[PDB]
C-alpha cells in the first residue's frame, strides 16, 4: 500500500488545521487564537504556570530547536529523499539488469 | 447501529456499551497511535510536526507531575 | 554547630579536584588541533578520540563533585 | 597532507611551480639562460 | 528544593516514572515496507551507522551482542536526550537504573571471559612483556580496576548527567534572579544558558555512545 | 498467551536462551547487590 | 500586522445595540433548551464547540481580571 | 480567507465577562491589599 | 558564626578549582600555535577547535563555580 | 562530635588527587591522537596501549576516592 | 572575629588558584617558542596567538584574584 | 578528641600525593603511543621503558599512600 | 588570636600558587631546548621568546607570593 | 592536645608536595621513551639525562617529605 | 596556644608548593633528552640551558620553602 503524499497540516508544529476549521463556523478566524491567549493569560494570571528557572531553561531549548529546526529541516528532508531515490533507482536498475539477462538468454 | 464513533453520538449509554477490558483500552490505545502514526508519521513528504506534536504533550505531560513541586515557588499568595 | 562547618570546608576540597579535569580537556583538544594540522584527511577519526578522551577526562573530575554533594547534602 | 595533495596534486607539479616562479623572479641578465636551461621539450605520445 | 528534578515523580499517586522510562521506544516506528517515511528512513540511516560503528571490531562471537549494543546506544541516548525537554524527569539521572544497566553488562562479559577464554582471561591482567619484579604489583592495579569498571560506568554517566541538568538549572535561576536587575547581563546570561544547552545536548550523545564503547571494550577483551 | 509469545519470546529466544545466559546470571548478581543495599537502609 | 484588525473589526468589536435583540432571543432559546431538556439533541460534536466558546468567554472574563488588577501575575500585593 | 460575522450571543457574553472581570479584579484589589498589609506587618 | 566562616573557606576552596581551566586554556592555544606553524592553511579549522577547547575547559570551570555558589547562598 | 568534621574536611582533602588521573587521561588520549595522526597503520595497537594507560591512570584515581570513603564512612 | 579569619584563609585558598594562569602562561610561550623555531616566516600571526593565549589564560588567573579580595574585602 | 580528628584531616591531605603519580602514569603511557607510532620496531624496548617509567610514578605516589596510613594507623 | 592563625594559615595558601609558576617556567625553558636543537640559529630570538614568557610566568607567582606577603603582614 | 594535631595536618600538607616528583618522573620517563624511539643510537646517553633528570625532580619531592618528618618526628 | 598550631599547617601548606619545582624540572630534563636526541652536536648548549632552566624552575620552589621557613621559624 502506497503512503499519502502530505501529513495532517499542524500549525507552529503545536496545533492542527482540524482545530481551526472545527472554530471557523462560530468564532471565526480569530477565534482559536482568542481562545489560546485567554488560556495563556489565565494559566499564568492563576498561576497555574509557575515562572520559575524552568521558563527560561524552556525558552532556551525551544529557541535551540526552533533554530535548529528552520536550519537543518531542508537538509535532513532532502536527505531522506535522496536516500529513498537512491534505493528506487538501484531497484529498477537490477530489475531491468535480469530482465535483460534472461533476454539474452 | 450504536457504533457511532464518539464526536457523532450524543447518549450516555454508548459510554458503557464500549469495550472496557484490558484488551479493549489496549486496541483503544493502539487504534490512537496508529491513527496519528498515518495522519502525521506515515506519509512520504512528513513533517516535523508529527514529532513536536508529541513532544509537546510530553512537556505538558512532564509539567502536570512536576507542579506540586512548583506551586511552592509562587510568587503571590492570593 | 560543626558538622556543617566541616562539610562546607570538604565541600570546597573536593571540588578541588576538577582541575585535573579542566588541564586534561586542555590537552585532549590541543592534541586534537595538532593531530589534526598533520593529518588533516583524518580529521573524523581523531576527532572521534577526542570526543572520547574529553569524555573520560571529565568523568574523573565530575567523581570528585559527587563526593562534593555527597559531603553537602548526603552527609 | 599539503593543501596541493588534498587537491590531487604531486610533488612534480609543486615544485615545476616553484621552480617557474623562481625563475620569473631573475633578473633578465640570467633570466634567458635560465629558462633555457630548464625548459621542456618532450612531447607525450 | 534544588534536587526537585531527580525525585521519582508521580502524577495522582502513580508512578509516572514507569511510563518515563518506557516512553523513548514508543519514538522508532518500525516498517515491514521496503521504502518508506521520512522518520523510518532518517532513523534506519542511523542505525546502520551506529551499528557499523560500534560492531566492527568484534569477532564472530561478540558481533552476536550487535541487538544489546545498539539497544543499549539507542535508548540511552534518545532517554538522555528526552531529559533535555521543560521540566522532564532524567531517569539516568538515578543511580539505581545506571547500576542496573552496568552491572548485568559487565559481569556478563567478564563471566563469558571466566567460562571460555579463562587460560586468556586470567592472562590479561597481566601485560604482555611486563619485568618480573612488577609482576605483583600490576595484578593488585589491574584487578581493583576490572572490579571498579562497573561502578564507575554507572556512575560516569549518573554524575555526568545529573550535574549538567544542575548547572542548567542554576544558570536558568540566574536569569530569573537578573530579570529584575540590568538587562544586558540578563542576555549575557541567556546566552550562557544556550551555549551550555548545546552543549548539554552533545553531553547526552556522548555519554550514550562511551557507556556502550566501555561495554564494547569489556566484551571485546573477553571474546 | 498467544500472539504475545509469537511477537515477543519466538523472536527474542535465541537472546534469551543462548546469547545472554552470562546477562542473566550478572543480572542475578546485580539483585543480589541491590537487595543488599536496600537492606542495608 | 494590519490582518489581524482586518479580521477583528468583524469578530473582535463589542455588540452593537441594534443585535443585542438577537442575543437575547439566542439566550432564551437555550434556556428552553435546558428547560424542556431538549439538550439530548446535541451531538457531542456541538456539544464540545459548545464547551470551547463557553470556555473563550470564560478566559474574556479572566482577561477582564488581569486588566482589573493592573497586574498579570496573581494579585501585585 | 473571509471572517465569520460571530454569533451576538457570544459577542455580548465576551464583552459583559469582560467587564465583570475588570470589575471583580479592582474588587478584590481592594478587598485583599489591607489584609495583605495586616499579615506583612504581624509577620514582624 | 563559624558557619559563614566555613562557608568563606568553603567559596575559596571550590573557586581553586579554574587553575585547571586556566592550564588548559594555555595547553590549547599553544597546541594552536603549533598546529598553525605545522599547516598554516587550516587557520580557520584550527581555530575553531581552539574555541571549541577553550569552550569545553571554561565548563569544567563552571563546574567548580556551581559548587562554590552552592556552598556560599544555597547551604 | 568533632571527628565527623575531620572526617568530612578529611575525605575532601583525600578526593582532591583525582585532578592528576584526569590530566593523565587528557594526556593519554591526546598522544592517541597525535601518534595515530603520525601512523594511522598501527590504529588498533596504539588504542589497545591507550586503554592500558588510562585503566592505569584512572586507577589512582580511584585509590584517592578509596581512601575518602575509607575516611568517610569506615574509619 | 572568627569571620575575618576564615576570610583570611578563603582569600588564601582561593589565590592558589593562579597556579593555573601560570603554567598556562609557560604552556603558551613554550609553544610559540617550538612554532616559532619550526616556521619562522610566521613570526607575525603566531605571536598574535600567543598574545591571545596569554589573554585568555591568565583572565582565568585573574578572576581567581578577583574572588580572592572579594573575600577579602567586599563579599 | 583532636588528635584523631587531625589525624584524619592529615591523612586526606597525604593522599593528594597521588596526583602527581596519576598525571606521570598517564604522561608515561601517551609518550609510549608516541614512540610506539614512530618506531613500532622497538615495541618491547619501549614498553620495558614505559612499565619501568610507570613502576617510579606509582613509587612516589605510593609513599605518599604509605604516608597517609602511617598518619592514620602508625602514629 | 585566631586572625594571626588565619593569617599564618592563608599565607600558606596563598605561596602554595607557586608551583603553577614553577610548571611554567620548567615548560617555557624546555620549549626552548627542543626549538633551539631544531633550528640552532635562531637563538637570539627563541632565547627572547624565552625571556618574555619566563617574565610573565614568573610574574603570575610573584602575585601569588605578594597577595601572601599582604596578608601575613600588611593584613 | 593542638599542637600534635597541627604536627599531623601540617605532616600531611607537606606530604601533598611529591605530586610534582611524580608527575616529573613520568614526564622524565617519557621523553625517554620518545627520544629513544627517535633516535636507537644514542640510548645510552639518553637513558643517562633521564637518570639526571630523575634524581633531580625526585630530589625535590624528597625535600617535602623531609619537611614532613620535620613537623611530624622532629620539631 | 593556636599560633603554633597555626605555624604547623602554613608550613606544610607553603612547602607544598615545590611540586611546581618538580614538575618544571621533569619537563625541562625530559625536553634536553628530546632535544639531544634530535641535534645531539648542541650538546654543550643545550645543557646549558637545561640548567639555567633548572635554576630558574627550582627558584620558584625556594621560594615556597624559604616561606615555610619564615612562618616556621622567623614569627
Ligand atoms: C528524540 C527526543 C528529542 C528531544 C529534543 C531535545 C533537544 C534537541 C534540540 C535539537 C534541535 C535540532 C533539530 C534539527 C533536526 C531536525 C530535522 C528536521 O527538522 O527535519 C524536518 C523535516 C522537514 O519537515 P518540515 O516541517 O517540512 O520542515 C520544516 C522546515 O525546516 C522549515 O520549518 P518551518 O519554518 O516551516 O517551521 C515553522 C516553525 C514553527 O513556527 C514557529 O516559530 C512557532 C514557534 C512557537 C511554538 C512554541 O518550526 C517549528 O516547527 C518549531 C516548532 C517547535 C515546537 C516544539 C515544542 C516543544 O521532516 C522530516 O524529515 C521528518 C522526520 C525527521 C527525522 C528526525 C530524525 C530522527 C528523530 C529521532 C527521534 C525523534
Ligand atoms: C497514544 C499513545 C500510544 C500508546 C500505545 C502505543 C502502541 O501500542 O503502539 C504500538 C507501538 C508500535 O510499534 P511498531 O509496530 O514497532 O511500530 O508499539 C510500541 O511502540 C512499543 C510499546 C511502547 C510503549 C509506550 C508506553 C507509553
Redesign the interface.
Given at each position: 500500500p502506497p503512503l499519502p503524499e502530505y501529513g495532517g497540516k499542524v500549525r507552529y508544529g503545536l496545533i492542527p488545521e482540524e482545530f481551526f476549521q472545527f472554530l471557523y463556523p462560530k468564532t471565526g478566524v480569530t477565534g482559536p487564537y482568542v481562545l489560546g491567549t485567554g488560556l495563556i493569560l489565565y494559566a499564568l494570571s492563576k498561576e497555574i504556570y509557575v515562572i520559575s528557572a524552568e521558563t527560561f531553561t524552556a525558552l532556551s531549548v525551544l529557541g535551540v530547536m526552533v533554530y535548529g529546526i528552520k536550519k537543518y529541516g531542508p537538509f535532513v528532508a532532502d536527505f531522506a529523499d535522496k536516500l529513498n531515490e537512491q534505493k528506487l533507482a538501484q531497484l529498477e536498475e537490477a530489475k531491468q539488469a535480469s530482465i535483460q539477462h534472461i533476454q539474452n538468454a | 447501529k450504536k457504533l457511532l464513533e464518539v464526536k457523532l453520538g450524543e447518549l450516555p449509554s454508548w459510554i458503557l456499551m464500549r469495550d472496557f477490558s484490558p484488551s479493549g483500552i489496549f486496541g483503544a490505545f493502539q487504534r490512537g497511535y496508529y491513527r496519528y502514526y498515518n495522519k502525521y508519521i506515515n506519509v512520504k513528504k512528513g513533517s516535523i510536526s508529527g514529532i513536536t506534536m508529541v513532544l509537546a504533550c510530553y512537556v505538558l505531560f512532564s509539567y502536570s507531575f512536576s507542579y506540586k513541586h512548583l506551586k511552592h515557588e509562587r510568587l503571590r499568595k492570593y | 554547630d560543626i558538622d556543617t562547618a566541616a562539610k562546607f570546608i570538604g565541600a570546597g576540597a573536593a571540588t578541588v579536584g576538577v582541575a585535573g579535569s579542566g588541564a586534561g580537556i586542555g590537552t585532549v583538544f590541543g592534541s586534537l588541533i595538532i593531530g589534526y594540522a598533520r593529518?588533516?584527511?583524518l580529521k573524523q577519526q581523531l576527532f572521534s578520540y577526542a570526543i572520547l578522551g574529553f569524555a573520560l577526562s571529565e568523568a574523573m573530575g565530575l567523581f570528585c563533585l559527587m563526593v562534593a554533594f555527597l559531603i553537602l547534602f548526603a552527609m | 597532507?599539503?593543501?596541493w595533495r588534498?587537491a590531487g596534486l604531486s610533488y612534480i607539479r609543486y615544485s615545476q611551480i616553484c621552480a617557474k616562479a623562481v625563475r620569473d623572479a631573475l633578473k633578465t641578465e640570467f633570466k634567458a639562460n635560465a629558462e633555457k636551461t630548464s625548459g621542456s621539450n618532450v612531447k607525450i605520445v | 528544593n534544588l534536587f526537585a528534578s531527580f525525585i521519582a515523580p508521580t502524577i495522582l499517586g502513580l508512578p509516572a516514572a514507569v511510563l518515563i522510562i518506557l516512553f523513548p521506544p514508543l519514538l522508532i516506528p518500525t516498517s515491514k515496507y521496503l521504502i518508506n517515511n521520512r522518520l523510518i528512513t532518517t532513523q534506519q540511516w542511523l542505525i546502520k551507522l551506529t551499528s557499523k560503528q560500534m560492531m566492527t571490531m568484534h569477532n564472530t562471537k561478540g558481533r552476536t551482542w550487535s541487538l544489546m549494543l545498539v539497544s543499549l546506544i539507542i535508548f540511552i541516548a534518545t532517554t538522555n536526550l528526552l531529559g533535555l525537554l521543560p521540566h522532564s524527569f532524567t531517569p539516568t539521572t538515578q543511580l539505581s537504573m545506571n547500576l542496573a544497566m552496568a552491572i548485568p553488562l559487565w559481569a556478563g562479559t567478564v563471566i563469558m571471559g571466566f567460562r571460555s577464554k579463562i587460560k586468556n582471561a586470567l592472562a590479561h591482567f597481566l601485560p604482555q612483556g611486563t619485568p618480573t619484579p612488577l609482576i605483583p604489583m600490576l595484578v593488585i592495579i589491574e584487578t581493583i580496576s576490572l572490579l571498579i569498571q562497573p561502578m564507575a560506568l554507572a556512575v560516569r554517566l549518573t554524575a555526568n548527567i545529573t550535574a549538567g541538568h544542575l548547572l542548567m538549572h542554576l544558570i536558568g535561576s540566574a536569569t530569573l534572579a537578573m530579570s529584575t536587575i540590568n538587562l544586558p547581563s540578563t542576555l549575557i546570561i541567556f546566552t550562557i544558558l544556550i551555549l551550555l544547552t548545546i552543549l548539554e545536548i552533545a553531553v547526552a550523545l556522548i555519554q550514550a555512545y562511551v557507556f556502550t564503547l566501555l561495554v564494547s571494550l569489556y566484551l571485546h577483551d573477553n571474546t | 498467551l498467544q500472539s504475545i509469545i509469537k511477537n515477543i519470546w519466538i523472536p527474542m529466544k535465541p537472546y534469551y536462551t543462548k546469547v545472554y545466559q552470562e546477562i542473566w546470571i550478572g543480572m542475578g548478581l546485580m539483585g543480589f547487590i541491590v537487595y543488599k543495599i536496600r537492606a542495608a537502609d | 500586522l494590519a490582518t489581524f484588525w482586518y479580521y477583528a473589526k468583524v469578530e473582535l468589536v463589542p455588540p452593537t445595540p441594534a443585535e443585542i435583540p438577537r442575543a437575547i432571543q439566542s439566550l432564551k432559546k437555550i434556556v428552553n433548551s435546558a428547560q424542556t431538556g431538549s439538550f439530548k439533541q446535541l451531538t457531542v460534536k456541538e456539544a464540545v464547540l459548545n464547551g470551547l466558546v463557553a470556555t473563550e468567554v470564560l478566559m474574556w472574563f479572566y482577561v477582564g481580571e488581569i486588566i482589573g488588577k493592573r497586574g498579570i501575575i496573581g494579585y501585585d500585593v | 480567507v473571509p471572517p465569520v460575522q460571530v454569533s451576538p450571543l457570544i459577542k455580548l457574553g465576551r464583552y459583559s465577562a469582560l467587564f465583570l472581570g475588570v470589575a471583580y479584579g479592582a474588587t478584590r484589589y481592594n478587598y485583599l491589599k489591607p489584609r495583605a498589609e495586616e499579615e506583612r506587618r504581624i509577620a514582624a
Open positions: - | - | 593529518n588533516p584527511s | 597532507v599539503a593543501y588534498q | - | - | - | -
